[PDB]
Design a protein that fits this description.
homodimer, nine-stranded antiparallel beta sheet, mainly beta, Calycin (chain A), PA_de_COase (chain A)
């Protein structure tokens, strides 16, 4: 009843959400195969990333899936159910990230060699699976390829974010 | 509140599915209970591999749509979507590099060989990770109840040639 590869209902979406473990995240679906994201709190609070290549598909009339692999070794797969305002994430963290998560807290784009070095040193295993629903607290449409959406770490945002 | 209980898995526990990814690889899963699956691979990169009692994270993300994710003794990560209402299936598999290089090393009844899988995982190379992200066509679905040890109990190569027509 719908086209699986029509992502026009999802590209441009800018979401802020809080996982049931209390961690607050933000994503911006920048185009059909790219996102920016910004972490506000939790294990890796203040980490942020631009231009992450991702696999984005439509799995229901208003439900989308977005998955990717990171320079740290982390794998991620998210479900965004816009029709029901439901969000679910699975994050597969390498063991070294669980052991010292602050190592990943940076603007990653300026530190890809560092992340790769940490990844390759490990320990990679055992993988830690974080699997949680989240509450979507903000959603807007910011179009494709909008570099103004995520342009600083969360700590540099106005205190009333996203009320602005 | 949500119009369904996202924590209620009763519509998915017990499900037995056979499906073929868009690249022709045929797989089979059995949702054994709220945090466990058995699975059986028929063809593709790792055809004939099968696994019982894989711990998994199983959730409901829509009225008739479920998600199942897990990590393996080989280092592989998996996350699947089963949309029963629309008969839609989507899988993402994150394979370690060593699995791409020598997939046959994983082709076994894994439960007989878990330490070996861990040894291969640890030897690596783990990276770069290979992502397989594909829709599949569901070709068979039935309900088998929870904790049914007869659903997946041999390698695919040992199934009758008319499988799953021999079942229901």
């Amino acid at each position: 009843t719908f086209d699986k590869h029509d992502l026009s209902g999802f590209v441009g979406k800018h979401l802020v959400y809080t996982y049931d473990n209390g961690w607050e995240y933000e994503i911006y679906v920048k185009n059909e195969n790219t996102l920016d994201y910004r972490i506000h709190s939790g294990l890796v609070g203040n980490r942020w990333v631009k231009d992450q290549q991702a696999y984005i598909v439509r799995v229901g009339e208003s439900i989308y899936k977005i998955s990717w692999t990171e320079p740290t070794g982390t794998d991620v797969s998210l479900i965004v159910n816009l029709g029901d305002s439901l969000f679910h994430g699975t994050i597969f963290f390498p063991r070294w990230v669980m052991n010292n998560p602050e190592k990943t807290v940076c603007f990653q784009n300026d530190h890809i060699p560092l992340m790769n070095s940490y990844r390759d040193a490990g320990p990679a295993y055992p993988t830690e699976v974080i699997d949680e629903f989240a509450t979507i607290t903000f959603v807007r449409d910011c179009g494709a390829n909008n570099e103004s959406v995520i342009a600083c770490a969360a700590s540099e945002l106005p205190k009333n974010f996203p009320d602005n």
